Amino acid sequence: NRAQKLLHYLGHVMVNGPTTPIPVKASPSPTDPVVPAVPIGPPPAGFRDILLREGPEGFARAVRNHPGLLLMDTTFRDAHQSLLATRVRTHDLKKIAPYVAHNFSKLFSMENWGGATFDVAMRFLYECPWRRLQELRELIPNIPFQMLLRGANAVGYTNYPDNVVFKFCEVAKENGMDVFRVFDSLNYLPNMLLGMEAAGSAGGVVEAAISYTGDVADPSRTKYSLQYYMGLAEELVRAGTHILCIKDMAGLLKPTACTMLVSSLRDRFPDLPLHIHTHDTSGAGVAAMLACAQAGADVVDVAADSMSGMTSQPSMGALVACTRGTPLDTEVPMERVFDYSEYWEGARGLYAAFDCTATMKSGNSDVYENEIPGGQYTNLHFQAHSMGLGSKFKEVKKAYVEANQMLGDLIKVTPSSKIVGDLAQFMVQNGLSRAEAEAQAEELSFPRSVVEFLQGYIGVPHGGFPEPFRSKVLKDLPRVEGRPGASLPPLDLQALEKELVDRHGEEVTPEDVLSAAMYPDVFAHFKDFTATFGPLDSLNTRLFLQGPKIAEEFEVELERGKTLHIKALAVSDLNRAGQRQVFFELNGQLRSILVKDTQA
Amino acid sequence: RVFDSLNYLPNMLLGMEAAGSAGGVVEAAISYTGDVADPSRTKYSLQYYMGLAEELVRAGTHILCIKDMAGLLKPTACTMLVSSLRDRFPDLPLHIHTHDTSGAGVAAMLACAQAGADVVDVAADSMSGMTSQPSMGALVACTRGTPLDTEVPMERVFDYSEYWEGARGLYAAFDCTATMKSGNSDVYENEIPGGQYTNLHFQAHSMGLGSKFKEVKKAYVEANQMLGDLIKVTPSSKIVGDLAQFMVQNGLSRAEAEAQAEELSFPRSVVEFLQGYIGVPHGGFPEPFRSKVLKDLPRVEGRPGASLPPLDLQALEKELVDRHGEEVTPEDVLSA
């Protein structure tokens, strides 16, 4: 039976607390979201038909030749971890796709998957990213989708055998993914080369991105010279791409840097469409974005107004309004923007249990000196509340810059940002200073992640890395040379499928196979949980998090005919072994379920 | 700082002569409303501000300022406007006051400073955004390697920001963030002043009207149309808010309210505005409502300040001492 299973989960939520951590004792607001009116006819035509009718080269040519400006929405991937910890369920997400496809037709693409999208969709949200992507494609047959992929590590933290990435990209393209963004934490050229090789082999639009760090207009800056970026761009275009992007994870894009860099790229490449992406952390995102659009930009990354500002991406409303009497002429009815923002403003109140509005009340400066990524700054906020960090949080970020300096000024996005962060965490919790740490580093123990970085799994940095520290810490540990992906022995994924089928698999799919091959432990945990309490991602947000309040009747629908009503009667007391009796009312029946309390 | 809610020149004049008689730096501010670049906008054309600026500079001032409660300052609008001012008055410094409610205040200020501005108002970093002024960090950092050369030590701005972030946590009993999570668009038609959008939204969410706040602004435009296209800073915002809340609580439509206005009572604030103690708008006000309610009741024409009988404040300290005063000071007399 299935209903008994979900009632069992509901009773467990009743008696016990929610499984996921709850940072703040708050509750979802008792306000339903408002779905705006939609037309009845077929949706209009956008850019997906070009891909269906021509090749990626033709689509890139059309985008380059298109007069004006283009936008692509990111309020589905980046605003999530930018402002939340990415706990947005698909159930809430599956109520705008009918609207946006019928109204928004000029969008460049849509961001569905990303870095903090697989593990979180299996560790705290007991769901399946493959399933999440599967039903959205039937809802937006108008706008191509885009996913964020890293070169060596696919979505994880360590390098992987290349053929695994090949199968991953092939299956992702087969399921319906359209545009691929290729990027690496460092600027290790073979990593990007492998990324574009996999993207081209799979078949689809290949997008290259270059992480930007420091001020490119300051003469004092010397580690990342001007000609360094143009040389990297020349190498990238020689490798063969379709669109060039400039990732700005920290939001350090000055208007002068904007205009001069975009002029330099457009000066020597009047063929490639330009892509841009920034996080509005300092508060000057919109001005730099206008400058970039004026100079040579073609595609712009935009989030909705309800998840703009703070540390998220610039709002749609400002760009639409400012580019009104402009030769760019976005020319999109901004009345629909208002209701689109209103929906998300209503929906944001559901996830009030955990939000960045706790201590970072407004946008923070001092990123030009901290250079901490936006997605990691929120998690540091989270940990600061977790340990109750007050003025001692200031020392935490005071310890970040010195650690970066000692390891050398390097670009930090997913892995290396985490490495610098937990190195600083370790050093500060030990209450140590820099000079003595430099002196006695052999006897001193370091976190395993620092050792992994110094070994060389991720790759070699541009300016090299210090020899005395690695000599004094590594001792006699093995070292990986050349490309770690090439040096890593290929693994057999066929044994994984039969192993899972033997253990608990009876209709495991290749997506599930490679998902378990990505992280076996959390895959096994999630699958066992689903086999324990039932199929999730069919319930409301307040039902999933808070639970049905007593003396209240709710309605849950599963199919066109599978419609049922739930009412909560009462809960008994601990009889003999911490066991509770809970009475539930269905449409016309009464059922009692036993719940094992965890406090014994 | 001399300012008037309306464009009624005599009020500005009285204020500025008063401030000059006091002795000190006196500068006037001009509220901005509507689009100056849109040809369809006719009530407030570019020359409309040209005449006001000419009159104010003829009266004799020191600094010129632009007031923007709703933050409707498009970059192109600012650059063309300040170009229109700077060329024909290349002596008076330009001052600009804006609110980053829409979400692009910083870009507008950057363009304004690039074109012809001299002084821009900027609030503290941890007390900025949302519905407030642009932050100090962006302005200081962006204008580093430019000929403008702000030249402000950007180290101390940080510690100022952490102090303000810490002290703001003391007043956590009531704050805009619990009410508004993020800065809002949709302000260009609404034109809600910043100091009232927040509290009105809070009231709507507090009395449970979370989904009924939209109807409040949905009738705001109709209320403004009823009273005529009007510049709104201090009084008129709350006046039209009272009218709209009256309309929504009564749950009545505009057409029939207009039709059967005979036996229907009219809100007090609307009548008080129609009387004209504040002044007169540009295009006049409807006659039927005021005739129906005010009738023969004291009708005031011209400048209400001059017509009002001046009163002695000397007996006020006498009565304050006689009632509860023994140390009363002129400041206390004025306050009472």
DSSP letter string, B185-241: --HHHH---HHHHHHHHHHHHHTT-SSSHHHHHHTHHHHHHHH-S---SSHHHHHHH
Mark residue B322 as left, alpha or beta (left: phi above 0; alpha: psi -120 to 50; beta: remaining): alpha
Q: B65: part of which helix (H) or strand (E)?
A: strand B63-67
Residue B206 tokens, joined: 């507090």
Non-local CB neighbours of A100 within 8 Å, separated by 6+ positions: A73, A107, A140, A143, A340
Q: Rounded distance, CA A196 to CA A235, Å?
A: 12
Q: Give A45's strand partners.
A: none
**Dihedral pair phi/psi, residue A61, rounded to 5°:** -65, -45
Q: Give A580's strand partners.
A: A595
Q: Rounded distance, CA A239 to CA A210, Å?
A: 14
Q: Rounded distance, CA A368 to CA B138, Å?
A: 10
Q: Rounded distance, CA A185 to CA A22, Å?
A: 31
The percent of chain A in helix, strand and coil, each rounded to the nearest 5, is: 45, 10, 45
B256 touches chain A (CB under 8 A): no
Non-local CB neighbours of A442 within 8 Å, separated by 6+ positions: A472, A473, A475
Mark residue A144 as left, alpha or beta (left: phi above 0; alpha: psi -120 to 50; beta: remaining): beta
Per the CB < 8 A criterion, the answer to whether A411 and A214 are in contact is no
Q: Rounded distance, CA B171 to CA A212, Å?
A: 38
Mark residue B67 as left, alpha or beta (left: phi above 0; alpha: psi -120 to 50; beta: remaining): beta
How many residue contacts between A and B have a Cβ separation below 8 Å?
146
Could you count the other beta carbons within 10 Å of the beta carbon of residue B212? 13
Q: Is A139 exposed, middle or buried (0-12, 13-18, 19+ CB in 10 A)?
A: middle
- For the sheet containing A579-585, what is the strand order? A553-557, A563-571, A579-585, A590-596
The candidate with the shortest Cα–Cα distance to A475, out of A503, A444, A437, is A444
Terminal-residue alpha carbon distance, chain A? 28
**Partners of residue B102 in chain A, C-beta under 8 Å:** 317-318, 321
Per the CB < 8 A criterion, the answer to whether A2 and A538 are in contact is no
The candidate with the shortest Cα–Cα distance to A114, out of A402, A412, A413, A405, is A413
Residue B143 tokens, joined: 């204008």
Q: Which amino acid is at B19?
A: A
Q: Cα torsion at B56, B61, B62, B65 (round to 10°)?
A: -30
- Quote the minimal CA–CA distance from B4 to chain A in Å: 28
The candidate with the shortest Cα–Cα distance to B215, out of B166, B177, B249, B178, is B249
Q: Give B123's strand partners.
A: B135
| Identity of the residue in B104, B129, B145 whose CB atom sits nearest the CB atom of A363 | B129
Q: Where are the beta strands (DSSP E) in A271-362?
A: 274-278, 299-302
**Beta-strand pair B27-31/A70-73:** unpaired
Residue A399 tokens, joined: 């310890």
* CB neighbour burial string for B226-257, b if at least 16 within 10 angstroms, e if fewer: bbeebbbbbebbebbbebbbbbbeeeeeeeee
Q: Rounded distance, CA A105 to CA A108, Å?
A: 9
With an 8 Å Cβ cutoff, are B211 and A337 in contact?
no
Q: Which of B 218-237 lie inside 8 A of A, CB atoms?
A: none
The candidate with the shortest Cα–Cα distance to A56, out of A211, A64, A68, is A64
Per the CB < 8 A criterion, the answer to whether A102 and A39 are in contact is yes
Q: Is A455 exposed, middle or buried (0-12, 13-18, 19+ CB in 10 A)?
A: middle
Per the CB < 8 A criterion, the answer to whether B115 and B83 are in contact is yes
Per the CB < 8 A criterion, the answer to whether B100 and B132 are in contact is yes
Per the CB < 8 A criterion, the answer to whether A511 and A173 are in contact is no
A366 three-state secondary structure: coil
CA angle B101, B105, B109 (to 5 degrees): 155
The candidate with the shortest Cα–Cα distance to A82, out of A400, A401, A390, A348, is A348
Q: Cα torsion at A118, A120, A123, A127 (round to 10°)?
A: -70
Report the length, in residues, of chain B.
336
Q: Rounded distance, CA B316 to CA B333, Å?
A: 7
Q: Rounded distance, CA B332 to CA B329, Å?
A: 5
Q: Rounded distance, CA B152 to CA B56, Å?
A: 33
- Quote the minimal CA–CA distance from A218 to chain B in Å: 7
Q: Rounded distance, CA A193 to CA A204, Å?
A: 16
Residue A511 tokens, joined: 């997506």
The candidate with the shortest Cα–Cα distance to B36, out of B27, B28, B45, is B45
The candidate with the shortest Cα–Cα distance to A182, out of A159, A203, A201, A154, is A154
Q: Rounded distance, CA A246 to CA A73, Å?
A: 17
**Partners of residue B158 in chain A, C-beta under 8 Å:** 365-366
Q: Which amino acid is at B167?
A: A
How many C-alpha atoms does B149 have within 13 Å on its Cβ side? 1
How many C-alpha atoms does A576 have within 13 Å on its Cβ side? 0
**Partners of residue A82 in chain B, C-beta under 8 Å:** none
B104 touches chain A (CB under 8 A): yes
Q: Rounded distance, CA A326 to CA A164, Å?
A: 47
**Dihedral pair phi/psi, residue A348, rounded to 5°:** -65, -30
With an 8 Å Cβ cutoff, are B106 and A286 in contact?
yes
- Quote the minimal CA–CA distance from B124 to chain A in Å: 11
Q: Is A29 exposed, middle or buried (0-12, 13-18, 19+ CB in 10 A)?
A: middle
Residue A124 tokens, joined: 């705290």
Residue A105 tokens, joined: 């037709």
State the helix-helix crossing angle for B235-250 and B268-275, rounded to 10 degrees. Answer: 140
Q: Rounded distance, CA B334 to CA B316, Å?
A: 9
State the helix-helix crossing angle for B46-59 and B75-88, rounded to 10 degrees. Answer: 40
Q: Rounded distance, CA A373 to CA A250, Å?
A: 5
Residue A380 tokens, joined: 């540091």
Residue carrying the six token digits 């090749």: A55
| 3-state SS track over A457-476 | CCCCCCCCCCHHHHHHHHCC
How many C-alpha atoms does A330 have within 13 Å on its Cβ side? 25
Q: Give A512's strand partners.
A: none
**Dihedral pair phi/psi, residue A190, rounded to 5°:** -60, -30
A213 three-state secondary structure: coil
Could you count the other beta carbons within 10 Å of the beta carbon of residue B267? 15
- Give residue A124's Cα distance to chain centre: 14
Residue carrying the six token digits 């001069």: A260
- Give residue A226's Cα distance to chain centre: 30
- Provide Rg for chain A, Cα atoms: 25
Structural resolution in Å: 3.3
Q: Rounded distance, CA B80 to CA B92, Å?
A: 17
| H-state helical runs in A214-281 | 226-239, 255-268
The candidate with the shortest Cα–Cα distance to A279, out of A538, A99, A91, A82, is A82
**Dihedral pair phi/psi, residue A591, rounded to 5°:** -130, 145
**Beta-strand pair B27-31/A579-585:** unpaired
- Provide Rg for chain B, Cα atoms: 23
**Dihedral pair phi/psi, residue A72, rounded to 5°:** -135, 135
User: What is the per-residue DSSP string for A64-111?
Assistant: HH--S-EEEE-TTTHHHHHHSSS---HHHHTTTHHHHHHH------EE
Q: A596: part of which helix (H) or strand (E)?
A: strand A590-596
Experimental method: cryo-EM
Q: Rounded distance, CA A286 to CA B135, Å?
A: 13
Report the length, in residues, of chain A.
600
Q: Rounded distance, CA A80 to CA A378, Å?
A: 11
Q: Is B4 exposed, middle or buried (0-12, 13-18, 19+ CB in 10 A)?
A: buried
